[PDB]
């Protein structure tokens, strides 16, 4: 193996040690470099009950450069692009080769909680958010409906 393929290893032996609440993943059969992962909708939020299926493509400079990640499901926020594609914080600018798998996955769960506004992916679920919250909860109340999928 790579320094890479060990790594994730680790990560997930961590990972299936002590799991964050709500979260769970692993690695596909075919290559340790493509995960699965679920995210289960913060409890007293928007997105409460919705089970969500995320994806995690790294690359073999992990974990210098950090993976990128995407919602299988189908999602509705203001950091989350058309195809899935989570824009945050820890993923890009500010990431650390300290963090792991189970950091990463516990990150994208508070965003849903508490998308931050600074340049939306998504403009219409950002618009609902700040001018109204009311059906913004009302879409994704329609999502979190969907996961169940």
């Given at each position: 193996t790579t320094p890479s393929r060990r790594r994730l290893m680790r990560d997930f032996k961590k990972l299936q040690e002590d799991p964050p609440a709500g979260v769970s993943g692993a690695p596909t059969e075919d290559n340790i470099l493509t995960w699965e992962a679920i995210i289960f909708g913060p409890q007293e939020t928007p997105f409460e009950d919705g089970t969500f299926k995320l994806s995690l493509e790294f690359t073999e400079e992990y974990p210098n450069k950090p993976p990128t990640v995407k919602f299988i499901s189908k999602m509705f926020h203001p950091n989350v692009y058309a195809d899935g594609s989570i824009c945050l914080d820890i993923l890009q600018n500010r990431w650390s080769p300290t963090y792991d798998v189970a950091a990463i996955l516990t990150s994208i769960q508070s965003l849903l909680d508490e998308p931050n506004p600074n340049s939306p992916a998504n403009s219409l679920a950002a618009q609902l958010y700040?001018?109204?919250?009311?059906?913004?909860?009302?879409?994704?109340?329609?999502?979190?409906?969907?996961?169940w999928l």
């Open positions: 700040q001018e109204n919250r009311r059906e913004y909860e009302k879409r994704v109340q329609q999502i979190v409906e969907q996961s």
